[PDB]
């Protein structure tokens, strides 16, 4: 499933027109990206949380070259899947259908 | 930011009523959970992908007890943040505002 196919699906479930479904998906996405960029967290119950995390200085092998190199600290985005999402994927809880 | 606050925001950006914004966020979430449960993948460009992954048998320390135990294989959900999301969080690319 890609964005288009997601948007198709969401259009049927929303009984919306498609443009509308497209604004929804773009602006959910956009909003989350924006909060985490600020370093804020987005917690969605039954889904998971999006957060910014900080990578400490580390060291890397440069694979094109072989040359080892030290990596300056970086902020990254990340998602922790919530208990209900895990439960369903794993087989523990049933999906409501 | 929690679901409510996300929903507030999305309501303003959608110029929707709130119930509508709530259906959007619930059914985006629900749809993704459902695809990954099937083991399908959800790829959203400029965001990232949601996928099911399989954890091999491993072994665990039971921390309540001390007792070491072997873990049977499990399917888990996961999100790989896409290049544009990483770029923005890291500081490499600018957010459009
Ligand atoms: Mn199931
Ligand atoms: Mn920036």
Curated annotation (Swiss-Prot), chains A, B:
<protein>
    <recommendedName>
        <fullName>DNA-binding protein HupB</fullName>
    </recommendedName>
</protein>
<feature type="modified residue" description="N6-acetyllysine">
    <location>
        <position position="3"/>
    </location>
</feature>
<comment type="similarity">
    <text>Belongs to the bacterial histone-like protein family. Long actinobacterial subfamily.</text>
</comment>
<feature type="modified residue" description="N6-acetyllysine">
    <location>
        <position position="86"/>
    </location>
</feature>
<feature type="modified residue" description="Phosphothreonine">
    <location>
        <position position="45"/>
    </location>
</feature>
<feature type="modified residue" description="N6-succinyllysine">
    <location>
        <position position="3"/>
    </location>
</feature>
<feature type="modified residue" description="N6-acetyllysine">
    <location>
        <position position="72"/>
    </location>
</feature>
<comment type="subunit">
    <text>Oligomerizes. Homodimer; the crystallized protein is missing the C-terminal 105 residues. Interacts with topoisomerase 1 (topA). Interacts with Eis. Interacts with NAD-dependent protein deacylase NPD (MRA_1161). Interacts with MRA_0812 CoA transferase.</text>
</comment>
<comment type="function">
    <text>A nucleoid-associated protein (NAP) that plays a role in local chromosome architecture. Binds DNA non-sequence specifically; in vitro phosphorylation of an N-terminal fragment decreases DNA-binding. Stimulates supercoiling relaxation by topoisomerase 1 (Top1, topA), at higher than 80 uM inhibits relaxation, has no effect on DNA gyrase; the effect is independent of DNA-binding. Increases the intervening strand passage activity of Top1 that occurs between the two catalytic trans-esterification reactions. Does not bind ssDNA, probably helps condense chromosomes.</text>
</comment>
<feature type="modified residue" description="Phosphothreonine">
    <location>
        <position position="43"/>
    </location>
</feature>
<comment type="function">
    <text>Has ferroxidase activity, converts Fe(2+) into Fe(3+). Binds Fe(3+) but not Fe(2+); prevents the generation of hydroxyl radicals by the Fenton reaction and thus protects DNA from damage. May function in iron storage.</text>
</comment>
């Amino acid at each position: 499933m890609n964005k288009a196919e997601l948007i198709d699906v969401l259009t049927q479930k929303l009984g919306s027109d498609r443009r509308q479904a497209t604004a929804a998906v773009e602006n959910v996405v956009d909003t989350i990206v924006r909060a985490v960029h600020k370093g804020d967290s987005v917690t969605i119950t039954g889904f998971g949380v999006f957060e910014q995390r900080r990578r400490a200085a580390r060291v890397a092998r440069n694979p094109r070259t072989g040359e080892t190199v030290k990596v300056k600290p970086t902020s990254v985005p990340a998602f922790r899947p919530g208990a209900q999402f895990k439960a369903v994927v794993s087989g523990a809880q049933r999906l409501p259908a």
